[PDB]
């Protein structure tokens, strides 16, 4: 029945998959999904993806603890660049284990909630939700901007494979309304798809 509002809170919890040991996780709750309020979006410390978990319902979660810690509010370093980067196609430079350069095409989706200096981004070749402090990358020349309802509905993604994935559209990107977030039943990532 009763639940506290945990958006903006730091949490820690255990996680158990199958027959493995419980593993320990610490993160920040970014959002509670309006079309499915059981579903929270979480950024875990040291992991780049944004995850969707039904924190209070998922039997894989244990020992859920809400900390009193307050996430610090910083003002972003360049409001203009921050605002105008939203919705843009980008080339985002990474380097890999061998130390060689590795450029990924992506799209900046939104400022992250809660963690004020972070941005939601997704990639052509890895279309799940990521979060980074992209102004840092931009300043270093590692992020270049390229020149240029369904929400709440149950959908499925069909393959030539023959099987399909079932999920729900959970968000429409304000800056790019043809783009949506999807939560699939079998998966804790948040998928990003252009549905027009």
């Amino acid at each position: 029945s009763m639940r506290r509002n945990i958006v903006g809170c730091r949490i820690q919890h255990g996680w158990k998959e199958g027959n493995g040991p419980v593993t320990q996780w610490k993160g920040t709750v970014l959002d509670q999904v309006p079309v499915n309020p059981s579903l929270y979006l979480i950024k875990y410390d040291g992991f780049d993806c944004v995850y969707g978990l039904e924190l209070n319902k998922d039997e894989r979660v244990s020992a859920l603890e809400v900390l009193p810690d307050r996430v610090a509010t910083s003002r972003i370093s360049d409001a203009h660049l921050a605002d105008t980067m939203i919705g843009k196609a980008v080339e985002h430079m990474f380097e890999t284990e061998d130390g060689s350069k590795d450029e990924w095409r992506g799209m900046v989706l939104a400022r992250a909630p809660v963690m004020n200096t972070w941005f939601y981004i997704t990639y052509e070749k890895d279309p799940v939700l990521y979060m980074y402090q992209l102004l840092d990358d931009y300043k270093e020349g590692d992020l270049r901007i390229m020149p240029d309802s369904l929400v709440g509905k149950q959908v499925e993604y069909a393959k030539e494979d023959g099987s399909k994935r079932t999920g729900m559209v959970i968000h429409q990107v304000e800056a790019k309304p043809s783009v949506y977030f999807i939560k699939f039943d079998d998966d804790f990532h948040i998928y990003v798809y252009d549905l027009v």
Binding site: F47, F94, E95, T96, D102, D137, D142
Partner: peptide
């Protein structure tokens, strides 16, 4: 540049 994290699963 940032390092890309190892793919999970």
């Amino acid at each position: 540049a940032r390092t890309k994290q190892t793919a999970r699963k």
